[PDB]
Amino acid sequence: MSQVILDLQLACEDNSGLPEESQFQTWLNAVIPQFQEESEVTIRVVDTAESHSLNLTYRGKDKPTNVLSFPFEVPPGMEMSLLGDLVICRQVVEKEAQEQGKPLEAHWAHMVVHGSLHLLGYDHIEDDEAEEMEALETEIMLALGYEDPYIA
């Protein structure tokens, strides 16, 4: 099997100019299935304020970020398909894509791809650990038809 049930939550004042739910679905299929097959993730797009708040109260960082990853812990001895949530700030994503001169769409995809990896247990604090994650990101991204966000 291969199935990623997506719960897309648009929680911005506007909600216009965001990726189509099918796009998120597409990006999600290129990252998760190959690790869980049967799974489901929630992804809510928010505004700087909420992001700022979530980031400060859960990561202890006074500022908004592009992607907050909240991986679901599975209680010892339990079958669970729920992977966690991705909180993506549209303001940050749009600003970054502009500063890095990347296609807004390609950056969004990167956000859910990177985020999804964090949901699956990947991290990038340790050089070796990061090397493995970026390798995967690059791979997934090329397979989606976007340029490799790395190699700069």
Ligand code: NI
């Ligand atoms: Ni990260």
